[PDB]
């Protein structure tokens, strides 16, 4: 399901691949937008945040 | 879902896309430089895929200001320039905005400069004599009417007289459209031209279309796409006649060289690119007729380091019907046009097209030139005075029959100061046929030195 | 006209059916120049058609752990990176018949005269091996190329490679289309021994000179045992490196069916320029001139195609005739040297010859071909065996032309044999001369009856004195095709016809020649 | 969806000098100067 919704809108793909920028930035940028809520299992959650 | 400018170097920009918009190849983008002195829109066309959806482009015009990371929008489609009647008598560059008249062509129908070549089914040859009117040419390399002529040469031995010339003695009574390419040629030489048909009422029926040697390599590159275009529009949306004048099409492949390593290619030998003769090929495929829709094309060809044997010429060689092929050597010993009979050649040049008396006389006169110039080595060591009396008089009659292949264009009324002369076929070749058999032995051989016909050949002699 | 319009698409539709087979696919990760990089299609082989969406198709040429490169065949343009690439099971193919004959077909098979469609027979590999050495046969049968130079000088025997080799505008195309209209009369015989069946392959030149030998071989009877392999140069590299192998796997599948062909590359050159664009667009390491390792190989490889073939196969042959164009007269560029190593003999056309007159202008001496008097029949063989000595004779003494007062007789007799000899050799395009009449012009020459004629005029009195004896004692004639050889009662008949037509003849310096 | 807006508040936080890194026989490399 989080492969499929970050195939689309490519932006939110583009910023979580930027490393440059530190990690603790796109780690909560995926929270805010993908992890961050009830429907997303603690495993798959860890896993995206890794 | 526009782009992204990643990497800059010199003409070549490569651009990062979104994963589903990534352009196809030869599609046109526009990028935006804002530095107020060099401030444009910058088209670039997409020239390669290279994966992790980044493209490379080449830069039409100068990428002098263009910042990394810049919006590049995508046009969907590849270089479109306009075509129809309303392109004649106007200057036009390789990107089809009108430089007489800015803005002119916006509303006209547009057709990208990228097509395949005409079938192999609607090819036939063209075997038609165009009298020009220049004894060399008219005599030892007949031009075709709707076949495709080449003016090579090296640098600076007259291709753009030559090709003026010609632009002179076919199109200005031609009842067809003619379009002229300057294809990195001299931007002088290019205004001289415009000027020129300006004043004999012929720019009416021509499309200049220009990209001169001060553009980057990307508009020497399609700039005669852009004008062939057009060409192509006239013989198959109108059917007229057409006349195409190229001047330089060896800029087309320098081009080509020029953004090649840029491009991630290998060089080949002498440092052109690999795909020299697939690239020069299509180009020079678009410009053939196809049967009932005639384009006259006529090339200048430009022969780097005077090298025949250079691949451009060498591979453009096949791509012509008639050839002819200016040398320094000829030009060194003052004779204008510049041709070197021997080299020089033509298709329609056989028995069954020309006739048997031009025929006749066309190959006494090589094989009198091809005696001569053997004989040269001889000459210049153990002096004419030791050849036999068959190859004394081969030589001297030689010597008149090279300086009577000179001829006083119109176009090169600046080179000499007197007015040029037209000589018509038939009188060439009876002037030929005298002199190949010995009527004109007696008269001086400065005589034969750019006049042009017998009456002027009487005159000059009566003169001297 | 017919129902046929709309029944051939009945056809289709009943007999139409797309199953659901298993297929690997790859994507394209790069594209440019020709090349696309194909991701994936892990058991693809080397040189395998693969297939892109829009229709398009390239040669897996290169196969690395990490992509495909595969050069395009045309329609390069509508390649993009993600495109689906599907594998074809299926190395480089061309279907091969006896429909191909009078038919252009693009290195792939297809045609592109705009008639019908071509009905194969079969289809045959590109790389297929050539004849062993067990499996061939010494080169003994003449394939009369109608060149008198050719045919008394460096004679071509079919199964042989000779190399037409020269700068341009040499006339190399008019020596091939000349060789492929002599084999007419060879046709209309229906005698399979001696039908020759030609295939013109054109490597890079352009549409409308492919249009004009078709036209030149249309208006001499000889498209129908003629196919024109054509690869102009609006094609892509991949077609102009591929089009020498689908004209010599339509002439071998002849060849191994008991039939004679001869095979016409035009040029070479452009073959291995093409490949040698496609190598560098691959990133394969160059050598000299910039060529690939292999590109000697890609020559080799497919002149050894042509062979004649034991009796056990059939007996069929394959005759080449590569065209080089050598820049600058210069024989010892890379591919010149690769193919005169590679061939069986040259034909030297140099550009000075030709302007000199000496047109079709090969150069005698220089020139060579290593299967020899096997390749000529008995007649030409004993008439033409004087010819070379006294060509190389006229060479030695052409410095003393003007002291002719000065030699001895016997060198003076060699000066004035040599010059109506090299006039003798001279012949007007598109006319090639059948084998016996080659035989009686060469008689004349070496003979000495040409000795009495001016020089300005053997070309005529040549000409005139065949147009005779066809025409009036055409007994020698059918004797020198029916038996081979020359004899004497026929012999002494051509003496008294020459001296006969010698009376009749006028000099056009209105001297008379008896 | 609300990605975007996710998107936007981190972008809210996401001179113009650069360093030299590499250089020698009048050929500098610049790391930096985005805007260049
Ligand atoms: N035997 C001949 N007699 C007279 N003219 C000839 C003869 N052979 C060739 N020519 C003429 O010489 C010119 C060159 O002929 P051809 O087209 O065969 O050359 P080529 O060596 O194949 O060169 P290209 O590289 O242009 O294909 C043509 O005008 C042809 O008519
Ligand atoms: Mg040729």
Not at chain 1, 43 to 48: G, Q, V
Not at chain 2, 273 to 279: F, S, V, Y
Not at chain 3, 102 to 124: H, K, M, S, W, Y
Not at chain 3, 469 to 485: L, M, P, Q
């Amino acid at each position: 399901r989080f492969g499929r919704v970050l195939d689309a809108e490519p932006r939110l793909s583009a910023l979580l691949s930027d490393y440059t920028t530190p990690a603790e930035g796109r780690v909560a940028l995926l929270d805010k937008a993908l992890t961050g809520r009830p429907g997303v299992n603690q495993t798959a959650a860890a896993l995206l945040s890794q | 879902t526009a782009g992204r400018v990643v990497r800059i170097t010199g003409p070549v920009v490569d651009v990062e896309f979104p994963r589903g918009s990534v352009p196809e190849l030869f599609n046109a983008l526009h990028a935006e430089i804002t530095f107020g002195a060099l401030a444009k829109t910058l088209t670039l066309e997409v020239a390669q895929h290279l994966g992790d959806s980044l493209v490379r482009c080449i830069s039409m015009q100068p990428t002098d200001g263009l910042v990394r990371g810049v919006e590049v929008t995508d046009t969907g489609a590849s270089i479109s320039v306009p075509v129809g009647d309303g392109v004649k008598g106007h200057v036009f560059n390789a990107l089809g905005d009108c430089l007489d008249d800015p803005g002119y062509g916006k509303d006209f129908e547009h057709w990208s400069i990228h097509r395949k070549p005409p079938a192999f089914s609607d090819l036939e040859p063209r075997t038609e004599m165009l009298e020009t009117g220049l004894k060399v040419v008219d005599l030892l390399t007949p031009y075709v009417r709707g076949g495709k002529i080449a003016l090579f040469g090296g640098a600076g031995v007259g291709k753009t007289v030559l090709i003026q010339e010609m632009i002179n003695r076919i199109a200005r009574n031609f009842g067809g459209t003619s379009v002229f390419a300057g294809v990195g040629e001299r931007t002088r030489e290019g205004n001289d031209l415009w000027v020129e048909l300006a004043d004999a009422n012929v720019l009416k029926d021509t499309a200049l279309v220009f990209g001169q040697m001060d553009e980057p390599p990307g508009t020497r590159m399609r700039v005669a796409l852009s004008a062939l275009t057009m060409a192509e529009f006239f013989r198959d949306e109108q059917g007229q006649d057409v006349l195409l004048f190229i001047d330089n099409i060896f800029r087309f492949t320098q081009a080509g060289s020029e953004v090649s390593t840029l491009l991630g290619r290998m060089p080949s030998a002498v440092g052109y690119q690999p795909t020299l003769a697939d690239e020069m090929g299509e180009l020079q495929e678009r410009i053939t007729s196809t049967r009932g829709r005639s384009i006259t094309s006529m090339q200048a060809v430009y022969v780097p380091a005077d090298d025949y044997t250079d691949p451009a010429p060498a591979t453009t060689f096949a791509h012509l019907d008639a050839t002819t092929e200016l040398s320094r050597a000829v030009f060194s010993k003052g004779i204008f046009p510049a041709v070197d009979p021997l080299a020089s050649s033509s298709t329609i040049l056989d028995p069954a097209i020309v006739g048997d008396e031009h025929y006749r006389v066309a190959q006494e006169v090589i094989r009198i030139l091809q005696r001569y110039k053997d004989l040269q080595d001889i000459i210049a060591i153990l002096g004419i005075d030791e050849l036999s009396e068959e190859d004394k008089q081969l030589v001297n009659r030689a010597r008149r029959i090279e300086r009577f292949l000179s001829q006083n264009m119109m176009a090169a009324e600046q080179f000499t100061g007197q007015p040029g002369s037209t000589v018509p076929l038939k009188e060439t070749i009876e002037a030929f046929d005298k002199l190949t058999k010995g009527e004109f032995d007696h008269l001086p051989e400065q005589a034969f030195f750019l006049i042009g016909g017998l009456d002027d050949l009487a005159k000059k002699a009566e003169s001297l | 006209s017919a129902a046929d319009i709309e029944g051939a698409i009945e056809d289709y539709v009943s007999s139409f059916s797309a199953d659901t087979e298993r297929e690997e696919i790859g994507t394209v990760i790069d594209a440019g120049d020709g090349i696309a990089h194909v991701e994936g299609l892990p058991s693809v082989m080397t040189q395998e058609l693969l297939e892109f969406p829009g229709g398009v198709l390239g040669v897996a040429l290169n196969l690395d752990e990490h992509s495909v490169g595969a050069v395009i065949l045309g329609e390069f343009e509508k390649i993009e990176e993600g495109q689906q690439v599907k594998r074809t099971g299926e190395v480089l193919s061309v279907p091969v018949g006896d429909a191909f004959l009078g038919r252009v077909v693009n290195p792939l098979g297809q045609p592109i005269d705009g008639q019908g469609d071509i009905a194969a027979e079969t289809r045959r590999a590109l790389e297929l091996q050539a004849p062993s050495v067990v499996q061939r046969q010494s080169v003994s049968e003449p394939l009369q190329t109608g060149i008198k130079a050719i045919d008394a000088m460096t004679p071509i025997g079919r199964g042989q490679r000779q190399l037409i080799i020269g700068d341009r505008k040499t006339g190399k195309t008019a020596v091939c289309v000349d060789t492929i209209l002599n084999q007419r009369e060879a046709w209309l015989t229906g005698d399979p021994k001696q039908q020759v069946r030609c295939v013109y392959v054109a490597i890079g030149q352009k549409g409308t000179t492919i249009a004009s030998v078709k036209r030149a071989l249309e208006e001499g009877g000889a498209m129908e045992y003629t196919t024109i392999v054509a690869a102009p140069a609006s094609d892509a590299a991949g077609f102009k490196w591929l089009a020498p192998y689908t004209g010599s796997a339509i002439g071998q599948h002849w060849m191994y069916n008991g039939k004679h062909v001869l095979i016409v590359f035009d040029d070479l050159s452009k073959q291995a320029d093409a490949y040698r664009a496609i190598s560098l667009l691959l990133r394969r390491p160059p050598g000299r001139e910039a060529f690939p390792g292999d590109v000697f190989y890609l020559h080799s490889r497919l002149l050894e195609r042509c062979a004649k073939l034991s009796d056990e196969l059939g007996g069929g042959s394959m005759t080449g005739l590569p065209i080089i164009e050598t820049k600058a007269n210069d024989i010892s560029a890379f591919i010149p040297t690769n193919v005169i190593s590679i061939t069986d003999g040259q034909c030297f056309l140099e550009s000075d010859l030709f302007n000199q007159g000496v047109r079709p202008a090969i150069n005698v001496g220089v020139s060579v071909s290593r299967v020899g008097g096997a390749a000529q029949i008995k007649a030409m063989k004993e008439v033409a065996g004087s010819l070379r000595l006294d060509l190389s004779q006229y060479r030695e003494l052409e410095a003393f032309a003007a002291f002719a007062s000065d030699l001895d007789a016997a060198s003076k007799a060699q000066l004035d044999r040599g010059a109506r000899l090299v006039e003798l050799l001279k012949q007007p395009q598109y006319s090639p001369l059948a084998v016996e009449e080659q035989v009686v012009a060469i008689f004349l020459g070496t003979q000495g009856h040409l000795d009495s004629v001016p020089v300005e005029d053997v070309q005529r009195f040549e000409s005139e004195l065949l147009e005779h004896v066809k025409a009036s004692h055409s007994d020698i004639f059918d004797g020198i095709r029916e038996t081979k050889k020359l004899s004497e009662e026929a012999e002494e008949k051509l003496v008294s016809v020459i001296n006969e037509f010698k009376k009749g003849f006028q000099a056009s310096d209105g001297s008379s020649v008896v």
